[PDB]
Design a protein around this ligand. Structure first.
Ligand SMILES: [Mg+2]
Ligand SMILES: [Mg+2]
Ligand SMILES: [Mg+2]
Ligand SMILES: [Mg+2]
Ligand SMILES: [Mg+2]
Ligand SMILES: [Mg+2]
Ligand SMILES: [Mg+2]
Ligand SMILES: [Mg+2]
Ligand SMILES: [Mg+2]
Ligand SMILES: [Mg+2]
Ligand SMILES: [Mg+2]
Ligand SMILES: [Mg+2]
Ligand SMILES: [Mg+2]
Ligand SMILES: [Mg+2]
Ligand SMILES: [Mg+2]
Ligand SMILES: [Mg+2]
Ligand SMILES: [Mg+2]
Ligand SMILES: [Mg+2]
Ligand SMILES: [Mg+2]
Ligand SMILES: [Mg+2]
Ligand SMILES: [Mg+2]
Ligand SMILES: [Mg+2]
Ligand SMILES: [Mg+2]
Ligand SMILES: [Mg+2]
Ligand SMILES: [Mg+2]
Ligand SMILES: [Mg+2]
Ligand SMILES: [Mg+2]
Ligand SMILES: [Mg+2]
Ligand SMILES: [Mg+2]
Ligand SMILES: [Mg+2]
Ligand SMILES: [Mg+2]
Ligand SMILES: [Mg+2]
Ligand SMILES: [Mg+2]
Ligand SMILES: [Mg+2]
Ligand SMILES: [Mg+2]
Ligand SMILES: [Mg+2]
Ligand SMILES: [Mg+2]
Ligand SMILES: [Mg+2]
Ligand SMILES: [Mg+2]
Ligand SMILES: [Mg+2]
Ligand SMILES: [Mg+2]
Ligand SMILES: [Mg+2]
Ligand SMILES: [Mg+2]
Ligand SMILES: [Mg+2]
Ligand SMILES: [Mg+2]
Ligand SMILES: [Mg+2]
Ligand SMILES: [Mg+2]
Ligand SMILES: [Mg+2]
Ligand SMILES: [Mg+2]
Ligand SMILES: [Mg+2]
Ligand SMILES: [Mg+2]
Ligand SMILES: [Mg+2]
Ligand SMILES: [Mg+2]
Ligand SMILES: [Mg+2]
Ligand SMILES: [Mg+2]
Ligand SMILES: [Mg+2]
Ligand SMILES: [Mg+2]
Ligand SMILES: [Mg+2]
Ligand SMILES: [Mg+2]
Ligand SMILES: [Mg+2]
Ligand SMILES: [Mg+2]
Ligand SMILES: [Mg+2]
Ligand SMILES: [Mg+2]
Ligand SMILES: [Mg+2]
Ligand SMILES: [Mg+2]
Lengths: 144, 124, 207, 62
RNA sequence: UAGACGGUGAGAGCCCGGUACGCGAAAACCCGGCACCUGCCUAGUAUCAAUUCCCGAGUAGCAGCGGGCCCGUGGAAUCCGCUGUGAAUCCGCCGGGACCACCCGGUAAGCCUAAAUACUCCUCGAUGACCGAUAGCGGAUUAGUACCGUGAGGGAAUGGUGAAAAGUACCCCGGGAGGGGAGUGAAAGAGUACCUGAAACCGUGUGCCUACAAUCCGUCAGAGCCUCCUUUUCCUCUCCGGAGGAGGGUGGUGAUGGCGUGCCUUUUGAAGAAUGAGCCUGCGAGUCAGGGACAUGUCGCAAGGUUAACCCGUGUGGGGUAGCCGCAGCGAAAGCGAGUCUGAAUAGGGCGACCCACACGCGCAUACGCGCGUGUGAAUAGUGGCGUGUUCUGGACCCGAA
RNA sequence: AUGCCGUGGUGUAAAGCGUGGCAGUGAGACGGCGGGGGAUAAGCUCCGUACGUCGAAAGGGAAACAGCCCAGAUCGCCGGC
RNA sequence: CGCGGCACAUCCACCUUGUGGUGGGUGUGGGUAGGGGAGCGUCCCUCAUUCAGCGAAGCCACCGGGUGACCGGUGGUGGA
């Protein structure tokens, strides 16, 4: 019978705690600092390179603008329609969420990477150019 | 959990003060001045466990040299004479024969003298 | 895998089948330890506190002049190097609770009950006392005909109030509902006694 | 609370698909008459941050 | 249905107060039910017409200077304040980030609205991997007292006999204070200076060394005394024991010989005539919060992992899919997508994707392979807990100014 | 003359290189050699040097003596060179 | 250099032929700032087990022990 005095964690899960500043036999008086300067009593910021112009102000900005109205399509490849649906049938935006190939409540989009051999009848948003070539060659149909 | 320190802290204070019984002044009475003295005593001991191997050897040579010159040989030629004769008696015992049994030290001189080169200043 | 249900002052009145995916799981020791630790840490009340140098009463002014005295310069009378000063890095009120996932809690529980079912330590009863008024002397005698050990877990339903009252003040008997089974209370007890209405509720809630 | 990302570094760096950090190049915003076009073409595009700045740029971008 | 907690001459469910569980309210107050009482309604409704009147004024709009919004006057809308100008009542008017046109939403300048939320001087009931007299409140004790300051204000120190006071009757030295003998008690090795009674510091007794020697005060070599134990042949008082002596061995001392420049911080370098410390006991410095950030150890599940607020439970347990990270990238972006941006390019490059160690058929080639079907079933991978190292925001390792 | 870059042999465990976690240091001193500033003065000042020791190195020698000569303390020994 | 103890690294043979021990060569082990690894001691809580008015803790003395922080035994005082 397992009791509570038989429970012990895995080897290496729980290491001890080096308490700094407790004697010369361990990390001693200066507690891993050694200095007499700013590093001895404070924290030097990352954004400060000594007084020269830093890396976040020498360099120019990245060009352009973010689009405020960018629609984003979640992506399923037709090489995963073959692997997840190996007997064909109707493929929809709702059947791809349950099979784990795409997220909820987003606009799906079938791309064309991989090998498709099943006769699938897929109904997505905004098919690719090479997706329509690989689905109709297997006898299927690609409807919006 | 607030921890009092005195049961832990007295363990090393009773070890220094028992190691310091026999020190005059404040060095048997006070923990701060008797820990300083234990740092020097255990260095002087380490320094002198290694130095007393060359103090007793410095005492044995002074007695081998003292008992060589009663048998009109020097220490300089007694040790040359005992390597050519193949006697590997160390200097602890070669200086203990000279006190305990002085008639067996004259015989070791006669072996060291006879097994020595005839002209000691000649090129070998 | 098969458990015979016992009656008070009587004999067997059936058999309850323990399913294998719920009572025959290999015991993961390094998983039961994280779930026990995450339960006892959620029982720390955490109410412990001290005062820092800005909450100890007084200590606003600089106490005397800095130069010319030959004393050290001291800043405030409630500094932590003083007697009566604030505590530096002292305890504050904490919430020592952890966030163990659901699939690790419910797997350490099944591992704890599997090690009971594998050693012949799971029992099943129809009730504890046959009547409706409680009686400890009859419920103590019936838990001694089952087991002879010191720590007994009794898992009975929430609606059976007449049997919960019979085993409240016994030394070494812990009482909980079927929907309150946890790893610490199962591993503490040498023996685990399910009511037959309570054993069919733990199984049915886990298919 | 919650860590704030440096607003000047999030406008001057970005990440690729495998975790490299890219940036643009200086000496190209103005004074462009005397510069031969083999120099303003060397300053075109984007480069990977050097291996000696890649630690500090990471702690700004996170 | 009582094994919660405490008290009693030491660990009490069965000795006491109580606990589980039940009963109990003259009167006063609060809550609720019903009467009395108080108030409202008992004339409009439906259809048609589209001419008229009304739909909150020094208000909205506009302009000047400001305030606040992610928005620091900017192309600057929405909202609010002062000055000037100053409308219209539905074909009216405001808003949808300058503005115009169409369209969609809405009726400003009058007022009142419970619940969800914030807090605890104070009242009851509970609790603590919180403190236990330098701690916990400043305050267990005359405590905001004594004391300091003209004032506003500052602001302490002090707990423990014993189970029971049984608190030492009586005699003795003494002016008393205090003690000795008796007596109490299990114990005065508990005596109102009181449980345990450490260290600094101060005496008394005793063993050894010390008054011709220049000493970081110790260390190694080392004689002589002193003490206490025992092989060893006597004393055979002899059964003994030590009576003594020779020998060995513990503990104390240390004549005398060598070596030896205190601890700490700071420094190129200190025994330093650089800095800090009179001594002892007590206290006094990398802590904690966050689904934070980067990296790693380990555990769970795995193309998935995980919930947050909240709801339900005597709990640490059971529900909860909103969200987050992974799932395909490139580009300033529209976009296109195993590719994509630059370009006139089927040029080259940037970023990204892409497995022959193995048999096959196979256009071919000395071979290895270039290519393609299928396994020999190429080896992948993320996420969420918990440890640790760093780091960010906060007082952030502690102490210290003018 | 040395020093430097390349290459082929031979020798050498704790050499090197890439990529991440955590650093500390960024006031040096003296002696050898080669030079500038100084009066070829300085325990002067500023350089160079797969040069040294100190820093951070105790032990032995130089009477004493961070830096000079010999030599790198794992611990024990009343052993030898 | 000789003779014994300890530790680290690597090599070479075994055992569950690395989750690790045993055995044998060779090499190594001064050290500040600092990095990494492995531990002693004190206090609180849970689980198990065992001592305690036939004397616990705390204290003092003595005799021992371990590679270090330190630990054990006997006795004295003490009273949970
Ligand atoms: Mg120190
Ligand atoms: Mg520094
Ligand atoms: Mg400095
Ligand atoms: Mg300092
Ligand atoms: Mg400047
Ligand atoms: Mg002495
Ligand atoms: Mg020697
Ligand atoms: Mg204040
Ligand atoms: Mg101040
Ligand atoms: Mg306080
Ligand atoms: Mg939960
Ligand atoms: Mg431009
Ligand atoms: Mg040009
Ligand atoms: Mg009790
Ligand atoms: Mg009683
Ligand atoms: Mg403004
Ligand atoms: Mg608009
Ligand atoms: Mg209105
Ligand atoms: Mg209106
Ligand atoms: Mg209102
Ligand atoms: Mg309200
Ligand atoms: Mg309340
Ligand atoms: Mg209260
Ligand atoms: Mg107090
Ligand atoms: Mg006390
Ligand atoms: Mg007054
Ligand atoms: Mg008297
Ligand atoms: Mg008396
Ligand atoms: Mg008596
Ligand atoms: Mg007593
Ligand atoms: Mg007193
Ligand atoms: Mg007393
Ligand atoms: Mg004399
Ligand atoms: Mg002299
Ligand atoms: Mg001397
Ligand atoms: Mg100086
Ligand atoms: Mg001094
Ligand atoms: Mg002096
Ligand atoms: Mg100074
Ligand atoms: Mg001083
Ligand atoms: Mg992008
Ligand atoms: Mg171009
Ligand atoms: Mg390309
Ligand atoms: Mg993982
Ligand atoms: Mg590195
Ligand atoms: Mg500098
Ligand atoms: Mg410099
Ligand atoms: Mg220099
Ligand atoms: Mg010169
Ligand atoms: Mg100089
Ligand atoms: Mg230094
Ligand atoms: Mg030296
Ligand atoms: Mg060196
Ligand atoms: Mg020297
Ligand atoms: Mg000398
Ligand atoms: Mg010689
Ligand atoms: Mg060495
Ligand atoms: Mg070392
Ligand atoms: Mg160090
Ligand atoms: Mg007694
Ligand atoms: Mg006794
Ligand atoms: Mg205790
Ligand atoms: Mg002891
Ligand atoms: Mg004892
Ligand atoms: Mg005792």
């Amino acid at each position: 019978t397992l009791k509570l005095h038989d429970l012990r964690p895995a080897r290496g899960s729980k290491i001890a705690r080096t308490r700094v500043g407790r004697g010369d036999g361990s990390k001693g008086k200066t507690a891993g600092r050694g200095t007499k300067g700013t590093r001895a009593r404070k924290q030097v910021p990352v954004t400060f390179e000594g007084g020269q112009m830093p890396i976040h102000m020498r360099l120019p900005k990245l060009k352009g603008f973010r689009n405020r109205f960018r629609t984003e399509y979640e992506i399923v490849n037709v090489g995963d329609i073959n692997r997840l649906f190996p007997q064909g049938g109707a493929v929809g935006v709702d059947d791809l969420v349950a099979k784990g190939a795409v997220r909820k409540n987003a606009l799906v989009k079938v791309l064309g990477d991989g090998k498709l051999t099943a006769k699938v009848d897929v109904s997505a948003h905004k098919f690719s150019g090479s997706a329509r070539a690989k689905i109709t060659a297997a006898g299927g149909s690609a409807t919006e | 959990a607030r921890v009092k320190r005195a049961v832990n802290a007295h363990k090393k204070r009773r070890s220094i003060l028992k190691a310091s019984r026999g020190y005059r002044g404040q060095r048997s009475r006070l923990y701060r001045k008797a820990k300083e003295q234990q740092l020097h005593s255990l260095n002087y001991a380490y320094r002198d466990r290694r130095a007393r191997k060359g103090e007793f050897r410095k005492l044995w040579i002074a007695r081998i040299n003292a008992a060589a010159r009663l048998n009109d040989i020097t220490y300089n030629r007694l040790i040359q004479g005992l390597k050519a004769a193949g006697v590997e008696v160390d200097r602890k015992n070669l200086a203990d024969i000279a006190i305990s049994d002085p008639a067996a030290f004259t015989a070791l001189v006669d072996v060291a003298r006879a097994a020595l080169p005839e002209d000691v200043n000649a090129p070998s | 895998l098969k458990i015979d249900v016992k009656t008070p002052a009587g004999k067997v009145d059936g058999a309850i089948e323990l399913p294998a995916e719920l009572f025959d799981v290999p015991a993961n020791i390094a998983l039961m330890h994280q779930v026990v630790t995450a339960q006892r840490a959620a029982a720390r009340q955490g109410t412990h506190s001290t005062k820092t140098r800005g909450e100890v009463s007084g200590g606003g002014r600089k106490p005397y002049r800095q130069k010319g005295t030959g004393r050290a310069r001291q800043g405030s009378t409630r500094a932590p190097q003083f007697t009566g000063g604030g505590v530096v890095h002292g305890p504050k009120p904490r919430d020592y609770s952890q966030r163990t996932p659901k699939k690790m809690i419910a797997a350490a529980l099944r591992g704890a009950l599997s090690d009971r079912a594998r050693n012949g330590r799971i029992h099943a009863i129809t009730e504890l006392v046959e009547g409706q008024n409680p009686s400890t002397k009859s419920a103590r005698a019936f838990l001694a005909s089952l087991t002879e050990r010191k720590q007994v877990l009794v898992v009975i339903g929430r609606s059976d109030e007449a049997g919960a009252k019979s085993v409240r003040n016994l030394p070494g008997v812990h009482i909980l509902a079927p929907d309150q089974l946890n790893t610490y209370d199962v591993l503490r007890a040498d023996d685990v006694v399910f009511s037959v209405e309570a054993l069919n509720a733990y199984i049915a809630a886990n298919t | 609370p919650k860590a704030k990302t440096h607003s000047g570094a999030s406008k001057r760096f970005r990440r690729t698909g495998t975790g490299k950090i890219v940036r643009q190049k200086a000496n190209r915003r103005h004074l462009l008459e005397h510069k031969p076009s083999t120099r303003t073409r060397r300053l075109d595009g984007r480069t990977v941050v050097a291996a000696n700045d890649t630690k500090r740029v990471t702690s700004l971008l996170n």
